[PDB]
Ligand SMILES: O=C1CC[C@H](N2C(=O)c3ccccc3C2=O)C(=O)N1
């Protein structure tokens with residue numbers, strides 16, 4: 001039920017906050033460096049630190065701009081925050097294998 005940073009245990013999100021974007025909460029995507037990510041969409045997350053300037057470039061989600069999301073405690077790269085779009089305006093795309101799932 002709770003998702004934590006795999007690298008240090010920081011509390012990050014909850015299964016109840018999962019967001020089916022375009023029919024599914026899971027999107028399997030590649031970046032321009034050839035890396036594949038199983039991205040889980042959450043409406044909400046906490047314990048992150050958002051870095052940099054939002055960008056539209058290479059966005060996997062049409063109409064959204066992204067910012068890198070680090071674990072706020074250890075600095076692990078956990079995913080991205082998306083903003084600037086519609087229904088919803090914002091959400092989080094977190095990398096599933098960088099989280100640990102467990103009891104509340
Ligand atoms: O929606 C997104 C999030 C950012 C992500 N991203 C990467 O992970 C990356 C690595 C190197 C150069 C450029 C990028 C890029 O835009 C990506 O490709 N799309």
Ligand SMILES: [Zn+2]
Pocket residue numbers: 005006007008009010071072073074075076
């Ligand atoms: Zn961490």
